[PDB]
């Protein structure tokens, strides 16, 4: 049998974060010897959902011109974002590289000023959390204006270390239980797990926060994160990543986006001018698609998805777990069928179904007729 247990209707002044965008939220399925039991999930895109955006920027020397064009981004993005949100917060972080040989020069001179002596570059660093999430865009402009460009030796940069920190450092970044945006801005490729071995870093990234005075202090000790490690911690801490990378590295980051769920790629201009419109285009792209995930499923039991998206386009297979072209406030529906076989222990299996990027989840509780 199939018996729904919880089903608060979807939402439609002032509203906190207790909005319901998915229904039902808890049901129990009794499963016979291979009998499909099907139920329907309804999703409605909230009209006005708050936004957290953390701006993580490459501050190596090739980004010198960009750093100048971001001195006002906090107020500019905030004003543009008000045409989307009533509750927006902004943050800023910077990264360069692991601060060890061979990725940086280790002469006392170049350790002080890694650039060509003439420039006013500050020392290389792994990750700096300049400004935690705040609604005061005035503070963003002030603090970004005080940041100094840096430099290092090899072309691909160390952003993956900083990405891991931003996702797993939680309250030190300031994340609320809202839609979380991490903007990754760079003009080069990336290092990842395995690259550390050249500098004698042969211990995998441990996926913990290691900030001291808003500085990552463990880049000399933990390797770069892998793609898979970033996937885990980005998903687990519910962060949607926007890759703002220059044209020549569009091929690289577009493939990266295909491996990172709820990620987007936009083309960054020379001195990073279209960053606002790029971000807006990304949010609309991220916000117009919902992707359902289910937790770990028991062995011998199978799950299938069917989508009923807008314009009655019905997708099957892996296309059934996602819908696109979702306007603000629109409703879509998914029917999910579960079919059993044997019957494991306890008879009390409970997995979650969740839309990627959101905290709301549907608890599907299973009972097996033995």
């Amino acid at each position: 049998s199939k018996d729904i247990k919880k089903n608060k209707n979807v939402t439609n002044k002032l509203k906190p974060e207790d909005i319901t965008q998915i229904q039902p939220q808890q049901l129990v399925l009794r499963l016979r010897s291979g009998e499909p039991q099907t139920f329907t999930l309804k999703f409605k895109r909230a009209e006005d959902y708050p936004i957290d955006l953390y701006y993580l920027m490459d501050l190596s020397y090739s980004m010198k011109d960009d750093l100048e064009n971001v001195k006002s981004l906090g107020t500019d993005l905030m004003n543009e974002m008000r045409r989307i949100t009533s509750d927006f917060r902004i943050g800023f972080g910077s990264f360069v590289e692991k601060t060890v040989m061979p990725y940086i020069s280790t002469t006392p001179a170049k350790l002080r000023n890694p650039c060509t002596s003439e420039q006013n570059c500050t020392s290389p660093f792994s990750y700096k959390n300049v400004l935690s999430l705040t609604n005061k865009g005035e503070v963003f402009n002030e603090l970004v204006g005080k940041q100094r460009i840096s430099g290092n030796l090899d072309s691909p940069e160390g952003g993956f270390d900083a990405i891991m920190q931003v996702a797993v450092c939680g309250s030190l970044i300031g994340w609320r239980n809202v839609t979380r945006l991490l903007v990754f801005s760079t003009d080069a490729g990336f290092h990842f797990a395995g690259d550390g071995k050249l500098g004698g870093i042969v211990l995998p990234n441990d996926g913990q926060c290691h900030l001291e005075n808003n500085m990552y202090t463990m880049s000399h000790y933990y390797d770069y994160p892998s793609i898979a490690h970033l996937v885990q911690k980005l998903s687990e801490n519910n962060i949607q990543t926007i890759f703002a990378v220059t044209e020549e590295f569009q091929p690289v980051y577009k493939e990266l986006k295909n491996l990172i769920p709820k990620s987007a790629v936009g083309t960054l201009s020379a001195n990073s001018s279209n960053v606002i419109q790029l971000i807006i285009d990304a949010y609309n792209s991220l916000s117009s698609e919902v992707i359902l995930e289910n937790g770990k499923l028991s062995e011998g039991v199978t799950i299938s998805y069917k989508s009923y998206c807008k314009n009655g386009v019905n997708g099957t297979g892996e296309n059934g777990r996602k819908c696109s072209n979702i306007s603000i406030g629109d409703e879509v529906q998914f029917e999910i069928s579960i079919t059993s076989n044997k019957c494991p222990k306890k008879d009390s299996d409970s997995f979650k179904i969740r839309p990627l990027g959101f905290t709301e989840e549907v608890e599907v509780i299973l009972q097996y007729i033995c």
Binding site: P102, L198, A228, E318
Partner: protein, 584 residues
Amino acid sequence: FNLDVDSPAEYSGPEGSYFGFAVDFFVPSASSRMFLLVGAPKANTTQPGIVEGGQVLKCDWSSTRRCQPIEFDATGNRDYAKDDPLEFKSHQWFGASVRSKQDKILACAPLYHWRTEMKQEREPVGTCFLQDGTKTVEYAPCRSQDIDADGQGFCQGGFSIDFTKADRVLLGGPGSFYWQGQLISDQVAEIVSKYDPNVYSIKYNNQLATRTAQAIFDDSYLGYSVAVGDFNGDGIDDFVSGVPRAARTLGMVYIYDGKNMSSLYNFTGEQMAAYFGFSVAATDINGDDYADVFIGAPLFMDRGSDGKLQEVGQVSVSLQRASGDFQTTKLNGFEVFARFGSAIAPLGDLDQDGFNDIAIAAPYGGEDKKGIVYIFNGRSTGLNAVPSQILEGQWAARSMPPSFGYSMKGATDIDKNGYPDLIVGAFGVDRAILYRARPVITVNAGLEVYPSILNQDNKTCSLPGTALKVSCFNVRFCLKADGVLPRKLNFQVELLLDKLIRRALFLYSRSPSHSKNMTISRMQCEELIAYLRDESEFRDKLTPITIFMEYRLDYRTAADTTGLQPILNQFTPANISRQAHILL
């Protein structure tokens, strides 16, 4: 399947020294004793002013498992001029790669940086020390006049090393030419001959080296890993090397001819940032004398039991066709984030069935991430994808994950028992373990029951106790057995009559069972007489009579002088059954 995981030799080093980061065997040509070569690249030495120069330890397989460091170099930093150091040995990671062939011992320090001769720099050209028999020379082919990242300044030469069978070193330098990477090969005789302690950039006449290419090839890390093997059929070992950051991090593997360093074949990874080429190995796995290519990608993501991507790692197995091509299949790891494929060690023929074997590690797998090593056997059809043995790491995480399996070396019979053994390093706890290969016994059992249809009135044999004649039949069982092995192998065979109220008994014992301590030399049969009980003693003449034999392990008395007990071949059936029937 035959590795002794019961009495392994356990070696440990100075705490924090990363003892076990690299392993190999020491087999001197003065074929006296054999030793384990273990790198401890973060080990403090007695060099004046040198913090953590690192060292390579020689461990005694003898009896006392005490390791003694090999003094390759006791000096501190040379000066180019007054107060102007020429080189910088602190944290140079000496012992990060250790490689041995007969009396030759080649170890390197990939993080060795030097000043250059035209400016005051700190450029990691990397250096190696080559200890032949008596002499001990330095080898730094990347310490040149082509300096800076534009040239060989950040080459880190010696990041990977290996020997060819014609006394060439193959050296890998991942940093040369803006991290294009570079492969360098010099004759061992020329490295020792042209050595001069007052020359900082030595020219070698018979040198093979890859040249600088276009900028699109920057950031490739050619030389991250190396291995040797013939791949165009000329008897000369060719150069295979992982290029893990090439093709926009899809990773590649280059193969270069061992004569003129020309490109032979390329492999290309299928997934972004999987680190295709983190390790490479070359060994003939299907017994056709064409070396086969093993390419590890420990970050490769597959599909889990659900729909989410999961890091499990992947090894590609490429079988060398004589047609020049490769027939390639792919083998995935088993545990998430275990880094299956971080290290690939050809084992030789671990069980000696005529097909070589291989180990593939997942240094962060198993319970509590203590490290796992998988043993895969070869056969005519390629690699048997089901691992025949799982070696588990035994040491809990002290400060760091133990990284059991991060380095490993095989293909050497250190106990001269006829079977090659395996060294596994666990640098995260300053440990290295030697696993002994047990000899493999193949047993051929027989069981005959004739006549098979049993006439209750054909009472031929006399029951030796009473005088009553009985209905009797023969139960004949055979046994045959065949490394360096004990002549007399003691087998314990037990027989059981009837499936269930045992209706059939042995003549000389009136019991359903027998048991016998028989001895085989690497045929042997033994005949018996069993009888039916009287028709009045039992009902049910319809259920058949199953004759169940069961031979058992050679137990204590089969052990070697070292206490190393052999093993029955993994194919061995546990028992054999026969049947007899009664008439109507």
